[PDB]
Copies of this chain bind each other. A is one copy, B any other.
Amino acid sequence: MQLYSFFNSSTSYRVRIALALKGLDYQVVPLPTLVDADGRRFSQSLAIIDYLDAVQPEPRLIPLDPLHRAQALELALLVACDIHPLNNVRVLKYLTQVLGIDAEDRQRWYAHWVAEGLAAAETLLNRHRRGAFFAGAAAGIVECCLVPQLANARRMGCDLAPYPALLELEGRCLALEAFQRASPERQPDYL
Protein backbone atom coordinates (compact mmCIF):
# COMPACT_ATOMS: atom_id res chain seq x y z
CA MET A 1 0.00 0.00 0.00
CA GLN A 2 0.89 3.68 -0.45
CA LEU A 3 0.17 6.53 2.00
CA TYR A 4 0.02 10.02 0.45
CA SER A 5 1.32 11.70 3.68
CA PHE A 6 2.73 15.13 4.70
CA PHE A 7 5.07 15.07 7.76
CA ASN A 8 3.09 17.89 9.51
CA SER A 9 -0.54 16.64 8.71
CA SER A 10 -2.15 15.49 12.03
CA THR A 11 -4.54 13.20 10.07
CA SER A 12 -1.52 11.63 8.22
CA TYR A 13 0.22 11.20 11.70
CA ARG A 14 -2.90 9.23 12.96
CA VAL A 15 -2.65 6.76 10.07
CA ARG A 16 1.22 6.48 10.24
CA ILE A 17 0.80 5.45 13.91
CA ALA A 18 -1.87 2.80 13.02
CA LEU A 19 0.39 1.44 10.17
CA ALA A 20 3.42 1.34 12.58
CA LEU A 21 1.39 -0.45 15.28
CA LYS A 22 0.30 -3.13 12.71
CA GLY A 23 3.88 -3.30 11.50
CA LEU A 24 2.69 -2.83 7.98
CA ASP A 25 5.05 -1.61 5.42
CA TYR A 26 4.01 0.84 2.93
CA GLN A 27 5.46 3.54 0.75
CA VAL A 28 5.16 7.14 2.06
CA VAL A 29 4.43 9.29 -1.03
CA PRO A 30 5.05 12.92 -0.02
CA LEU A 31 -4.37 14.01 2.83
CA PRO A 32 -3.87 11.37 3.89
CA THR A 33 -4.82 8.96 1.08
CA LEU A 34 -4.21 5.23 1.63
CA VAL A 35 -4.08 3.34 -1.75
CA ASP A 36 -4.52 -0.43 -1.13
CA ALA A 37 -3.29 -3.38 -3.31
CA ASP A 38 -6.39 -2.95 -5.63
CA GLY A 39 -5.87 0.81 -6.26
CA ARG A 40 -8.80 1.76 -3.95
CA ARG A 41 -8.26 5.22 -2.29
CA PHE A 42 -9.39 6.11 1.33
CA SER A 43 -8.89 9.56 2.90
CA GLN A 44 -10.70 9.69 6.27
CA SER A 45 -8.18 8.65 8.99
CA LEU A 46 -10.77 6.95 11.25
CA ALA A 47 -12.23 4.86 8.31
CA ILE A 48 -8.62 3.87 7.38
CA ILE A 49 -7.94 2.78 10.99
CA ASP A 50 -11.15 0.67 10.98
CA TYR A 51 -10.17 -0.85 7.56
CA LEU A 52 -6.63 -1.73 8.82
CA ASP A 53 -8.30 -3.82 11.56
CA ALA A 54 -9.93 -5.89 8.72
CA VAL A 55 -6.66 -6.00 6.67
CA GLN A 56 -4.60 -7.29 9.70
CA PRO A 57 -6.70 -7.92 12.78
CA GLU A 58 -3.78 -8.36 15.31
CA PRO A 59 -2.87 -6.28 17.10
CA ARG A 60 -6.37 -4.76 17.24
CA LEU A 61 -6.79 -0.93 17.01
CA ILE A 62 -10.59 -0.87 17.90
CA PRO A 63 -12.01 -3.18 20.62
CA LEU A 64 -14.47 -6.04 19.82
CA ASP A 65 -16.47 -5.65 23.09
CA PRO A 66 -19.45 -3.32 22.26
CA LEU A 67 -19.16 -1.18 25.46
CA HIS A 68 -15.30 -0.90 25.22
CA ARG A 69 -15.69 -0.08 21.50
CA ALA A 70 -18.30 2.67 22.20
CA GLN A 71 -15.92 4.18 24.84
CA ALA A 72 -12.89 4.07 22.41
CA LEU A 73 -14.92 5.61 19.54
CA GLU A 74 -16.39 8.24 21.87
CA LEU A 75 -12.87 9.55 22.72
CA ALA A 76 -11.53 9.12 19.12
CA LEU A 77 -14.54 11.09 17.69
CA LEU A 78 -14.26 13.81 20.37
CA VAL A 79 -10.80 14.45 18.89
CA ALA A 80 -11.62 13.80 15.19
CA CYS A 81 -14.97 15.75 15.12
CA ASP A 82 -14.89 18.31 17.99
CA ILE A 83 -11.21 19.52 18.18
CA HIS A 84 -9.07 18.93 15.08
CA PRO A 85 -11.53 20.16 12.35
CA LEU A 86 -11.73 23.68 13.94
CA ASN A 87 -7.88 23.95 14.18
CA ASN A 88 -7.00 22.60 10.66
CA VAL A 89 -4.47 24.58 8.49
CA ARG A 90 -7.37 25.20 5.95
CA VAL A 91 -9.58 26.83 8.73
CA LEU A 92 -6.75 29.07 10.13
CA LYS A 93 -5.94 30.08 6.46
CA TYR A 94 -9.66 31.08 5.98
CA LEU A 95 -9.67 33.06 9.30
CA THR A 96 -6.55 35.10 8.22
CA GLN A 97 -7.03 35.72 4.42
CA VAL A 98 -10.91 35.96 4.29
CA LEU A 99 -11.85 37.35 7.75
CA GLY A 100 -8.43 39.06 8.56
CA ILE A 101 -8.19 37.60 12.11
CA ASP A 102 -4.64 38.40 13.50
CA ALA A 103 -2.11 35.76 14.83
CA GLU A 104 -3.21 36.46 18.47
CA ASP A 105 -7.00 36.02 17.88
CA ARG A 106 -6.14 32.79 15.91
CA GLN A 107 -4.10 31.66 19.01
CA ARG A 108 -7.14 32.23 21.29
CA TRP A 109 -9.45 30.44 18.79
CA TYR A 110 -6.98 27.49 18.61
CA ALA A 111 -6.62 27.48 22.44
CA HIS A 112 -10.42 27.71 23.06
CA TRP A 113 -11.34 24.51 21.07
CA VAL A 114 -8.23 22.61 22.51
CA ALA A 115 -9.19 23.58 26.10
CA GLU A 116 -12.87 22.48 25.77
CA GLY A 117 -11.92 19.24 23.94
CA LEU A 118 -8.90 18.15 26.04
CA ALA A 119 -10.84 18.71 29.32
CA ALA A 120 -13.47 16.22 28.00
CA ALA A 121 -10.64 13.87 26.67
CA GLU A 122 -8.90 13.93 30.11
CA THR A 123 -12.34 13.04 31.71
CA LEU A 124 -13.06 10.14 29.28
CA LEU A 125 -9.52 8.65 29.46
CA ASN A 126 -9.57 8.67 33.32
CA ARG A 127 -13.12 7.14 33.36
CA HIS A 128 -12.77 4.39 30.74
CA ARG A 129 -9.02 3.47 30.41
CA ARG A 130 -8.50 -0.30 31.02
CA GLY A 131 -4.71 -0.37 31.62
CA ALA A 132 -1.46 1.29 30.46
CA PHE A 133 -3.29 2.31 27.22
CA PHE A 134 -6.99 3.17 26.77
CA ALA A 135 -7.79 -0.41 25.57
CA GLY A 136 -5.43 -2.13 28.11
CA ALA A 137 -1.92 -3.43 27.23
CA ALA A 138 -1.81 -2.10 23.58
CA ALA A 139 -2.20 1.35 21.97
CA GLY A 140 -5.11 1.77 19.53
CA ILE A 141 -7.41 4.29 17.83
CA VAL A 142 -7.52 6.49 21.01
CA GLU A 143 -3.67 6.92 21.07
CA CYS A 144 -3.65 7.30 17.24
CA CYS A 145 -5.94 10.37 17.71
CA LEU A 146 -4.54 11.85 21.05
CA VAL A 147 -0.77 11.81 20.14
CA PRO A 148 -1.12 14.09 17.05
CA GLN A 149 -3.68 16.34 18.87
CA LEU A 150 -1.26 16.84 21.82
CA ALA A 151 1.71 17.59 19.50
CA ASN A 152 -0.44 20.24 17.72
CA ALA A 153 -1.77 21.77 20.96
CA ARG A 154 1.89 21.92 22.34
CA ARG A 155 3.22 23.56 19.14
CA MET A 156 0.40 26.23 19.23
CA GLY A 157 1.37 27.24 22.81
CA CYS A 158 -1.61 25.67 24.63
CA ASP A 159 -1.45 25.06 28.43
CA LEU A 160 -1.36 21.23 28.79
CA ALA A 161 -0.88 21.27 32.62
CA PRO A 162 -4.67 20.55 33.23
CA TYR A 163 -4.40 17.16 31.38
CA PRO A 164 -1.95 14.99 33.38
CA ALA A 165 -3.40 11.59 32.28
CA LEU A 166 -3.31 12.67 28.58
CA LEU A 167 0.38 13.76 29.02
CA GLU A 168 1.17 10.47 30.80
CA LEU A 169 -0.46 8.42 27.99
CA GLU A 170 1.43 10.53 25.38
CA GLY A 171 4.77 9.64 27.12
CA ARG A 172 3.92 5.88 27.20
CA CYS A 173 3.22 6.11 23.42
CA LEU A 174 6.30 8.21 22.48
CA ALA A 175 8.54 5.61 24.30
CA LEU A 176 7.47 3.00 21.64
CA GLU A 177 9.39 2.48 18.33
CA ALA A 178 5.99 2.45 16.40
CA PHE A 179 5.21 6.05 17.56
CA GLN A 180 8.87 7.15 17.11
CA ARG A 181 8.82 5.77 13.48
CA ALA A 182 5.46 7.56 12.73
CA SER A 183 6.52 10.91 14.26
CA PRO A 184 6.71 13.94 11.96
CA GLU A 185 10.40 14.54 12.83
CA ARG A 186 11.36 11.00 11.66
CA GLN A 187 9.54 11.32 8.26
CA PRO A 188 11.43 11.36 4.87
CA ASP A 189 9.80 14.74 3.80
CA TYR A 190 10.85 16.39 7.18
CA LEU A 191 13.46 19.33 6.90
Docked CA distance A152–B50 (Å): 28
A158 CB-CB contact with B under 8 Å: no
Which residues of chain B have C-beta atoms less than 8 A from A55's C-beta? 66
Interface size of A as a range: 35 or more
Docked CA distance A42–B60 (Å): 22
Q: Which of A47, A51, A109 has the most CB of B within 10 A?
A: A47
| Copies of this chain present | 2
Docked CA distance A181–B66 (Å): 27
The residue that A99 contacts in the complex, of B69, B78, B84, B99, with Cβ under 8 A, is: B99
Chain A interface residues (CB < 8 Å from chain B): 40, 42-44, 46-48, 50-51, 54-55, 66-67, 69-71, 73-74, 77-78, 80-82, 84-86, 91, 94, 98-99, 101, 105, 108-109, 112
